[PDB]
Amino acid sequence: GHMPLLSASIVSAPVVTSETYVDIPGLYLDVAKAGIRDGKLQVILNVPTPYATGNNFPGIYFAIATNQGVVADGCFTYSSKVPESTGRMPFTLVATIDVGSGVTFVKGQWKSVRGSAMHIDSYASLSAIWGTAA
Amino acid sequence: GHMPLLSASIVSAPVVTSETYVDIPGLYLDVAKAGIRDGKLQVILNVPTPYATGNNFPGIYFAIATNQGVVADGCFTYSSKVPESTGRMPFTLVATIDVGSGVTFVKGQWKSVRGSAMHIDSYASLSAIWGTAA
Amino acid sequence: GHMPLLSASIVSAPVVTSETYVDIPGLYLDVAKAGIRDGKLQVILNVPTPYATGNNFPGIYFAIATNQGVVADGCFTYSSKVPESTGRMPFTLVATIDVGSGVTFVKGQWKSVRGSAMHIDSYASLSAIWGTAA
Ligand SMILES: C[C@@H]1O[C@H](NC(=O)c2ccc(-c3cccc(N)c3)o2)[C@@H](O)[C@H](O)[C@@H]1O
Numbered sequence: 001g002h003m004p005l006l007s008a009s010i011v012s013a014p015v016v017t018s019e020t021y022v023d024i025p026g027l028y029l030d031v032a033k034a035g036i037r038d039g040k041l042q043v044i045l046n047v048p049t050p051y052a053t054g055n056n057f058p059g060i061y062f063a064i065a066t067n068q069g070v071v072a073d074g075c076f077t078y079s080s081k082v083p084e085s086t087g088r089m090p091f092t093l094v095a096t097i098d099v100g101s102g103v104t105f106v107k108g109q110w111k112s113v114r115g116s117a118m119h120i121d122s123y124a125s126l127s128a129i130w131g132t133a134a
Numbered sequence: 135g136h137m138p139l140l141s142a143s144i145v146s147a148p149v150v151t152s153e154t155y156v157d158i159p160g161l162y163l164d165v166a167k168a169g170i171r172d173g174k175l176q177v178i179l180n181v182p183t184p185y186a187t188g189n190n191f192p193g194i195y196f197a198i199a200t201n202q203g204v205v206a207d208g209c210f211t212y213s214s215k216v217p218e219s220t221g222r223m224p225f226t227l228v229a230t231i232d233v234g235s236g237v238t239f240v241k242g243q244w245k246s247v248r249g250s251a252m253h254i255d256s257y258a259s260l261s262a263i264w265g266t267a268a
Numbered sequence: 269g270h271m272p273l274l275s276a277s278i279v280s281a282p283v284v285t286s287e288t289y290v291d292i293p294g295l296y297l298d299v300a301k302a303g304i305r306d307g308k309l310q311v312i313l314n315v316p317t318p319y320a321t322g323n324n325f326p327g328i329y330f331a332i333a334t335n336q337g338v339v340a341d342g343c344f345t346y347s348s349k350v351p352e353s354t355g356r357m358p359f360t361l362v363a364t365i366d367v368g369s370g371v372t373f374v375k376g377q378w379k380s381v382r383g384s385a386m387h388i389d390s391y392a393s394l395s396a397i398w399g400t401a402a
């Protein structure tokens with residue numbers, strides 16, 4: 001049937017700040033295009049090597065979003081006001097969505113903690129597994 | 135057949151300490167209620183934004199448990215005795231269990247590192263995918 | 269059919285350094301032995317409790333590799349030159365591979381950041397879910 005495994009990956013994104021959730025370019029799954037219109041998707045946003053730069057306990061919020069908006073989110077933050085070096089802080093987020101609710105796409109998004117610039121310069125992925133009771 | 139994707143999520147838990155693994159309230163999957171009695175479950179415990187508070191290199195242990203007890207565990211810990219700010223330390227744990235062994239539920243659990251108080255104040259999830267050779 | 273859930277887990281590995289990706293002993297899935305020769309695998313490398321020791325902002329790179337080499341990688345790093353204590357830095361990596369390309373096994377691998385010694389002394393896992401459009 002429909003291939004039940006969906007995936008998108010990137011190796012970089014332009015460095016930005018944001019006060020709201022904004023798409024991480026390339027982390028996008030087109031569910032409607034796949035003909036998936038019911039059942040559930042287990043979605044994993046994997047950003048294994050991010051870093052944040054800023055002047056006030058930097059960090060990044062990440063979200064899984066659909067056309068209906070944010071379904072789940074989280075963040076990492078450093079434990080010092082201005083880290084001596086902004087270390088790489090692995091981040092994974094997992095959510096399960098009902099496609100029947102009207103889901104046509106899934107995206108990874110990010111937002112600044114305290115004005116931080118947001119850095120991806122290596123592999124990151126957005127994955128989904130489709131399940132049905134049919 | 136049985137919907138092969140199971141999930142539970144929370145956005146907070148009462149702040150506690152524990153010297154043993156104790157349930158994270160709400161992170162519970164009822165496998166027996168779903169009629170799943172054989173095959174395997176790939177379980178993901180996702181706690182993307184925890185923090186620990188304490189006086190001695192704080193942290194949190196997390197576990198995946200069934201009615202048979204802990205199947206897998208791990209922790210995060212800070213790298214300073216008393217962090218200047220207790221940053222958010224994303225945590226994910228993945229284990230695969232044989233349901234045929236007698237599994238009726240799956241839970242997320244947590245335990246203090248060195249007496250730490252344990253904090254969830256945003257999204258966290260427990261997910262499972264059922265697979266069968268049938 | 270073929271059990272669509274594959275998993276391997278360990279609780280320790282000999283402490284090593286490496287300037288290249290080297291196998292994490294025991295984190296190995298034999299895909300060919302399972303008779304899986306097409307479709308896709310969603311692979312998760314879960315190293316929830318590693319630490320790195322070294323003198324120069326320590327860390328560990330991790331990779332998912334097949335017989336064809338590295339498909340995805342990432343790292344954690346500390347935010348201090350010589351951490352007061354090398355805290356536990358949870359790490360997860362997720363990649364989806366096309367088995368049809370000629371994949372016969374999947375492995376977790378690791379490599380030093382800046383000469384770090386690499387430590388696993390508790391649970392770690394390598395998991396895969398097989399999906400087919402057939
Ligand atoms: C901001 C600093 O960034 C440094 N890493 C790199 O400059 C870099 C460039 C490419 C990569 C990288 C990562 C993960 C997988 C792969 N293959 C490559 O890392 C860190 O070592 C410091 O600790 C610190 O966080």
Ligand SMILES: C[C@@H]1O[C@H](NC(=O)c2ccc(-c3cccc(N)c3)o2)[C@@H](O)[C@H](O)[C@@H]1O
Nearest residue numbers: 057073074075077183185219220221222256
């Ligand atoms: C203990 C401190 O906690 C602060 N965060 C919050 O007080 C907070 C309240 C709600 C949330 C939060 C998280 C993740 C997703 C969402 N949507 C919301 O965070 C951090 O900024 C500091 O770095 C530090 O760890």
Ligand SMILES: C[C@@H]1O[C@H](NC(=O)c2ccc(-c3cccc(N)c3)o2)[C@@H](O)[C@H](O)[C@@H]1O
Nearest residue numbers: 191207208209211317319353354355356390
């Ligand atoms: C290097 C130091 O390592 C300490 N942990 C241990 O020595 C240890 C030995 C077994 C385990 C361990 C872990 C995860 C799950 C389980 N069950 C057991 O941890 C940390 O507390 C410090 O913060 C610090 O990182």
